[PDB]
RNA sequence: GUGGGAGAGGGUGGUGGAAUUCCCGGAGUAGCGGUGAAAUGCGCAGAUACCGGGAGGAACGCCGAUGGCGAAGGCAGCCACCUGGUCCACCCGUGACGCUGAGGCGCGAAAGCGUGGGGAGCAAACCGGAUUAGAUACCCGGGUAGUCCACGCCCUAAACGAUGCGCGCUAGGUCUCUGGGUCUCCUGGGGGCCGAAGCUAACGCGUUAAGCGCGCCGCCUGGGGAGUACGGCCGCAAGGCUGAAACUCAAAGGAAUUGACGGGGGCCCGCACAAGCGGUGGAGCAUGUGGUUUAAUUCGAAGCAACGCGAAGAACCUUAC
RNA sequence: AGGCAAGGAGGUAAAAAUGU
């Protein structure tokens, strides 16, 4: 936290597709350390995707993720007149993580009864370009531009 | 720490008590109309003082500029 | 009624409180001017670099709507937006002939306000 | 708040309003623009919510300025007078008390509502007897300039009253 | 004395630009200004920003120095004039004419005051706006006296090198300015920096000594009372000089040392914050505590480091009430 | 071109009375 750069965990890759991104998403989904339950949820979502917008559900998921990956976000920094929301660029891995988080939030903000279903729907929405996660991303982008003044307070 | 030239040796032998001679004195101003400091001109203290006085005289008469628009930037 | 020229002068007044860019004719008759508060930015941002840049861009755009093309950048006052403003102008496609400083420094003229003393 | 002016307007037919109140009816937007140019003014879409949008030939900038002025007036008429607070203590000597009273009076004169809290700290049990007495005394002193807006209300390590000017 | 300099030395007469501000002309428009943020403030009766001209005061950027001059206070555009100090070389003249200097006369920053102007900026007071518990303050917007000049008075200062003046001596190195020389090196005279001896409570000073000496002057004699009263003097006034004691404390004080500290500086660090997940605060209950109640609700634990703690087992016992 | 600095700027620095 102070001493070193503190490396990223190389997540043990997936089984159904062999993708680390997939694993990451599963992890994000999972609460209370119940991976199997979440992994199952993810696979249900995938199945739903396959059923509906008849495409390879991994690819769709990836597309969705890409759609919600931000480039600019507003870090809170104090420069005198209390704190300023200060727009800065977001690092790749970090950005990905953020996107995943947002996606998960969107999924578990959605109306319908069951999570797997919700997740699938969210993914579809992201792929399309609309809905929760994407909206969040848009908001964040706006915040970055509506504060672009302060940009020069690069950390 | 700036090692290029010095307006003492750069110029030939001249009279810096001569303020009519101005093409010899525009050597000692900046890109601004500013008297170059010691480490720019490379004259002795007395000499420098004399030069400054001459420059001022020239300016008063209107031969060397008092202030200038700084080009390029 | 517009007058048109294609050439001219871009006076950038960069204060710390605000940057104001007046674009004007090759003689110096104000064509179109822009400021911090002009482009919405009212407050501290008014004289922030980004704000200055924005103002400059606006001014350039306005000039272009008078067929103005080739400008002569004159920069007065050191402020946050003087460089940024210049950059913006350069970007705008407006042919910046020369960037020339004209900071109105007193030749030890009359006394500043208390803030600008202390450093005397 | 703000509208579409001349070139900003993309809608084809618009209802043209004059500098004072000249009803020109539903004209083309282009025609309106031309008219504005002739007048050396600008047509600004004043009612985009109306039958083929209502648009006034005006000096838009002037109108904006006027609006701003009005806003300023509204906020300057919002009364700059507010709450001044004067924390007293339990063991406050006489001179200091009088100074505080003077301050309060000044505030009242200015036009201000006065939060006249008594700070407590240590024992904070005998507090109302002495603190309350002090408050009462203060009120008595300001019988003529201050009407008691409130009545002593102990929250934290303190008890606050508010005071109001006698006559407005 | 002869010859020669260096200089923001002093006065006087001029004058040259930048800038500000204002007026006027233009062109142009919705803000400008300001700030840590703001707000008053000025702005379509057209401001700001821009060019053209004029008015006017005041200061003199760059050179600029760690520099120079002056006895200090001080003194900076440039020119001219008057004039002061000063240094050097020549050793030419006088031949002890020297040094100091109580009183005295003169000078003496700034603020101040008086009369006359002048007034651009600035700016005490003052009026606004904020900030704040308050704000008579910092921060901003204005604004008078003042600041500028003329003449008159005031005389103080951290008028400080906190180092009275002079002369002699007692290592050097060094940068410097400014003279002289048979001149990449000597010799004078200033201004700094580091150091021999020495000194010094130490800090430091150290050929510009705070060293060694000598001469003369000033002054001190614990702190506070107090630069006060009282007297005297000076001043138009403010006030200055001169200058106590009664009392009162066991100190007041210097230099440094070790710490502690800092809304000093650097280098670090910790789940410190941040990035993240989860809770606490909200419910109910469980527990412990405060409080209050009570015959008693034993007793202890108190920010972190007390509060599911002593208690790893209160129905009786335990239990101390 | 990068080096290392010399020097000018411009941004940070601006917010703190309560016991036993
Ligand atoms: Mg002579
Ligand atoms: Mg005008
Ligand atoms: Mg002789
Ligand atoms: Mg003889
Ligand atoms: Mg005497
Ligand atoms: Mg005076
Ligand atoms: Mg002012
Ligand atoms: Mg006030
Ligand atoms: Mg106030
Ligand atoms: Mg003020
Ligand atoms: Mg006077
Ligand atoms: Mg005096
Ligand atoms: Mg001194
Ligand atoms: Mg002095
Ligand atoms: Mg003394
Ligand atoms: Mg004497
Ligand atoms: Mg001297
Ligand atoms: Mg010497
Ligand atoms: Mg020794
Ligand atoms: Mg020494
Ligand atoms: Mg020496
Ligand atoms: Mg001694
Ligand atoms: Mg006195
Ligand atoms: Mg007397
Ligand atoms: Mg001490
Ligand atoms: Mg955290
Ligand atoms: Mg604990």
Numbering used by the authors:
A (entry chain G): 2 to 156
B (entry chain R): 16 to 88
C (entry chain K): 10 to 129
D (entry chain X): 3 to 170
The authors write:
In bacterial translational initiation, three initiation factors (IFs 1–3) enable the selection of initiator tRNA and the start codon in the P site of the 30S ribosomal subunit. IF3 is a two-domain protein that plays a particularly important role in the fidelity of selection of tRNAfMet and correct start codon.
PICs 1A–1C contain IF1, IF3, and mRNA (but lack tRNA) and differ only in the conformation of the 30S head. The 30S head is observed with the same canonical swivel seen in 70S ribosomes (Selmer et al., 2006) or eukaryotic initiation complexes (Hussain et al., 2014, Llácer et al., 2015) in most complexes, namely, PICs 1A, 2C, 3, and 4 and PICs I and III. In tRNA-free structures (PICs 1A–1C), the dumbbell-shaped density is seen for nearly all of IF3. The NTD binds near the 30S platform with a possible interaction with uS11; the bulk of the NTD is positioned away from 16S rRNA. The CTD density is observed at the top of h44 adjacent to the P site making interactions with both h44 (1494–1497), h24, and with G1517 of h45. The CTD in these complexes is positioned such that it would clash with the tRNA in reported structures of the 30S PIC (Simonetti et al., 2008, Julián et al., 2011). CTD at position 1 also occludes the binding site for H69 of large ribosomal subunit and hence would prevent premature subunit association. In tRNA-free PICs 1A–1C, we observe an unusual mRNA conformation, in which a base at −1 position of mRNA stacks with G926 in the E site, while the next base, the A+1 of the AUG codon, stacks with A790 in the P site. Regardless of whether the mRNA purine is A+1 or G+3, these CTD-mRNA interactions suggest a role for IF3 in identifying and stabilizing a good candidate start codon in the P site, even before tRNA binding.
